[PDB]
Design an enzyme around this catalytic site. Structure first.
Site, PDB file in Angstrom:
ATOM      1  N   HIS A  23       0.828  -1.196   0.000  1.00 31.40           N
ATOM      2  CA  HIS A  23       0.000   0.000   0.000  1.00 31.40           C
ATOM      3  C   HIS A  23       0.862   1.246   0.000  1.00 31.40           C
ATOM      4  CE1 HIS A  23       0.448   2.256   3.752  1.00 31.40           C
ATOM      5  NE2 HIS A  23       0.592   1.114   4.401  1.00 31.40           N
ATOM      6  N   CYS A  24       0.274   2.355  -0.413  1.00 29.21           N
ATOM      7  CA  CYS A  24       0.983   3.620  -0.396  1.00 29.21           C
ATOM      8  C   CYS A  24       0.030   4.673   0.163  1.00 29.21           C
ATOM      9  CB  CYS A  24       1.511   3.990  -1.794  1.00 29.21           C
ATOM     10  SG  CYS A  24       0.422   3.728  -3.190  1.00 29.21           S
TER      11      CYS A  24
END
Ligand code: CL
Ligand code: CL
Length: 175
Positions: free
Chosen positions: A97-98
């Protein structure tokens, strides 16, 4: 649905739709199910890979998440000495994820599979099961703040970190 990367078994988690049609996305609720041990009898280990830049991570991330924004560091951490499960019955899962889980996260996910395939004899893989956290940290934080630390959110484009952004990008392999 399809089997995981090494065709050994089905994907364990419920998925949601995401931009990258070929990738598997999970919701913040599913992420919490993992963190709260709802799958402890099946999942031996899971790693949350936060691919945002260091200053973003330091301003607030998911508990236990590891900050691996550079491909070379993610490869080293995950593939130099592959994370194996307690037994052959339990699974190892990776969650990428970012900030929005739109670009950096999916890119790292694809990169790891690329390297995994490279060091394995088809169809074996060290990380056959990988997911992307839908919405990234931006959508996770407002839902489960007590599962984050510190309890805050610092966007990539934060006005006070313009220099930090440039400094970090000059460390990437490609732009
Ligand atoms: Cl999306
Ligand atoms: Cl990089």
């Amino acid at each position: 649905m399809e089997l995981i990367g090494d065709y050994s078994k089905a994907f364990l988690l419920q998925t949601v739709d995401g931009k990258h049609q070929d990738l598997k996305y999970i919701s913040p609720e599913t992420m919490v199910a993992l963190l709260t041990g709802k799958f402890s009898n099946i999942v031996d280990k899971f790693v949350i890979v936060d691919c945002r830049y260091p200053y973003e991570y330091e301003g607030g991330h998911i508990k236990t998440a590891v900050n691996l924004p550079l491909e070379r560091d993610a490869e080293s951490f995950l593939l130099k000495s592959p994370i194996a499960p307690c037994s052959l019955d339990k699974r190892v899962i990776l969650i990428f994820h970012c900030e929005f889980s739109s670009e950096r996260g999916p890119r790292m996910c694809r990169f790891i599979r690329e390297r995994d395939l490279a060091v394995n004899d088809y169809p074996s893989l060290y990380y056959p099961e990988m997911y992307i956290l839908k919405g990234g940290y931006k959508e996770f934080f407002p839902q489960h703040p007590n599962f984050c630390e510190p309890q805050d959110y610092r966007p990539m484009n934060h006005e006070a970190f313009k220099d930090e952004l440039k400094t970090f990008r000059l460390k990437t392999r490609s732009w």
